[PDB]
């Protein structure tokens, strides 16, 4: 509350529109982090089961232009390109949703006179179901899990996919 | 590390080039310095300067960069 | 995920996204009452 108000004072431009450190930003980032945990699980499954065609094939520079060449004389793999395009699909969906939101959906950029949602605090009430509380709880948990997964990957030396598999118990692959 | 061995014959490379506008001829023309990717050859003399100071490995340069980041902070 | 991917991941960012966002925000700031 104090942090939210002081940020609203410091950066009226972002806070007035709902950007920055706001409950709306928290909700949106929780949504994206949950979707991202799901995406990591799905890519783990696909990679383990070999469902990605030509995963280890290096894209041809002659065909795909200089963009197909990586930083240090390396080539982007077909697997990396496929995953990037999979992200491109949802990124276009994202731009379209942000510029032309559904009438019923929540809007990324809030109007000038919008009423900020009440800051939940330590934990919102445990309203079990498809409810704005459960959404926030799971979004916070997913964001924390994303950070934890990255740090486990870096510390233990395992890949992020390997860490996800180990945590889930090798059910994925 | 390969310049400190034969400094009079090796060209010191400043940094790698990643330009999505380069053609294959440009990439090949800029691939020099004994590396395998297009590069810029330094004209600042930092190689000679650091070699004289006492830097021999890339870890020394990395530690110096870390310290200077800390000092900037 | 190796360091060799960092140039391809970053140069487009630093050269198109950072300038675009900076230009948009600076435009909004300079033209604002």
């Amino acid at each position: 509350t104090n942090a939210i108000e002081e940020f609203a004072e410091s950066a009226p431009e972002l806070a007035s529109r709902g950007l920055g450190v706001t409950t709306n930003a928290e909700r949106w980032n929780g949504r994206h982090a949950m979707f991202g945990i799901f995406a990591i699980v799905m890519t783990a499954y696909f990679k383990g089961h070999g469902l990605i065609p030509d995963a280890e094939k290096i894209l041809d520079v002659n065909q795909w232009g200089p963009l197909a060449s990586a930083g240090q004389g390396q080539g982007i793999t077909n697997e990396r390109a496929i995953i990037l395009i999979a992200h491109v699909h949802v990124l276009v969906v994202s731009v379209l949703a942000a510029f032309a939101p559904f009438q019923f959906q929540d809007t990324l950029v809030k109007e000038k006179g919008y009423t900020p949602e009440a800051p939940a605090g330590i934990i919102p009430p445990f309203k079990t179901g498809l409810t704005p509380e459960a959404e926030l709880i799971n979004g916070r948990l997913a964001m924390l899990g994303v950070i934890s997964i990255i740090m486990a990957s870096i510390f233990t030396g395992n890949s992020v996919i390997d860490v996800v598999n180990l945590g889930l118990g090798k059910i994925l692959f | 590390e390969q310049w400190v061995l034969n400094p009079l014959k090796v060209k010191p490379v400043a940094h790698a080039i990643w330009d999505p506008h380069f053609g294959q001829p440009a990439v090949k023309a800029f691939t020099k310095g004994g590396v395998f990717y297009p590069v810029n050859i330094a004209t600042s003399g930092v190689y000679h300067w650091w070699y004289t100071i006492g830097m021999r490995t890339n870890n020394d340069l990395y530690a110096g960069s870390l310290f200077l980041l800390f000092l900037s902070g | 995920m190796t360091a060799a991917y960092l140039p391809s991941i970053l140069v487009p960012l630093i050269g198109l996204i950072f300038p675009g966002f900076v230009m948009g925000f600076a435009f909004i700031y300079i033209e604002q009452e």
Binding site: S10, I154 | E1, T57, N58, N59, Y62, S65, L66, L69, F70, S72, G73 | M1, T2, A3, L6
Partner: peptide
Amino acid sequence: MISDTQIFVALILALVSLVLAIRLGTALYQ
């Protein structure tokens, strides 16, 4: 020879310096 972990430590220090730079920019703008 420079490892990804080394580059990541450098990036973390750069991010810390960026945060401090933003703080200084705000304080100077005031």
